[PDB]
Amino acid sequence: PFLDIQKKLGISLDRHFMFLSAEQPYKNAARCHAFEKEWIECAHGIGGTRAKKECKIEFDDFEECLLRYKTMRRMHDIKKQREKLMKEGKYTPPPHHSGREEPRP
């Protein structure tokens, strides 16, 4: 913040709900709690300029957890190949994936 009134006075008007890893009602952690925590603890201390290069792995994991682009790519590719193989006639959907399974408790 431009003027650090809150840090100066020791109060926390709005600094406690900045990210997904902050305290949630009834201790229900948000999606990607672990990833965000890792990224932020990695990036503490070192400046932003250094973090942008030295916490990149953590940030990449975090964005993957939150948006999930690569997961969508992977599932799309798997189901695309499934469709191609099925149209060719070289694959069958197993019983458990088809609709009849031995349902587990």
Partner 1 sequence: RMMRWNQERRRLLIEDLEARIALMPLFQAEKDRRTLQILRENLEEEAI
Partner 2 sequence: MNNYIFVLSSLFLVGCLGLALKPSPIYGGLGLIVSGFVGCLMVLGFGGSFLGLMVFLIYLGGMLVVFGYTTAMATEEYPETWGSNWLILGFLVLGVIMEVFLICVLNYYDEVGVINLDGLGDWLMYEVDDVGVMLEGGIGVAAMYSCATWMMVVAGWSLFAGIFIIIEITR
Partner 3 sequence: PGIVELPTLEELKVEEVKVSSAVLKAAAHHYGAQCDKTNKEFMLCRWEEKDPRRCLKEGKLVNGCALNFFRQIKSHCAEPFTEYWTCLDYSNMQLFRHCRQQQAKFDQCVLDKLGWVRPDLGQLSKVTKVKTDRPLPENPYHSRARPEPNPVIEGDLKPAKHGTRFFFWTV
Q: How far apart are CA 92 and CA 98, in angstroms?
A: 9
- Least Å from the CB of residue 78 to partner 1: 6
Does residue 55 interact with partner 3 by CB under 8 A?
Answer: yes
| Cα angle, residue 37 at apex, residues 31 and 39 outer, rounded to 5° | 110
Does residue 86 interact with partner 1 by CB under 8 A?
Answer: no
Does residue 72 interact with partner 1 by CB under 8 A?
Answer: no
The count of residues in the chain is 105
**Residue 100, both tokens:** 């009849």
Partner whose footprint covers residue 58, from partner 1, partner 3, partner 2, none (CB < 5 to 8 Å by kind): partner 3
- Least Å from the CB of residue 25 to partner 3: 19
Cα distances from 43 to residues 23, 59, 80, 94, in angstroms, run: 20, 10, 39, 46
- Least Å from the CB of residue 56 to partner 2: 23
Among 11, 41, 72, 92, binds partner 3 (CB under 8 A): 41
Q: At what angle are helices 33-43 and 56-67 packed, to 10 degrees? A: 160
Binding footprint of partner 2 on the chain (CB under 8 A): 13-14, 16-17, 23-26, 28, 31, 68-69, 72-73, 75-76, 79-80
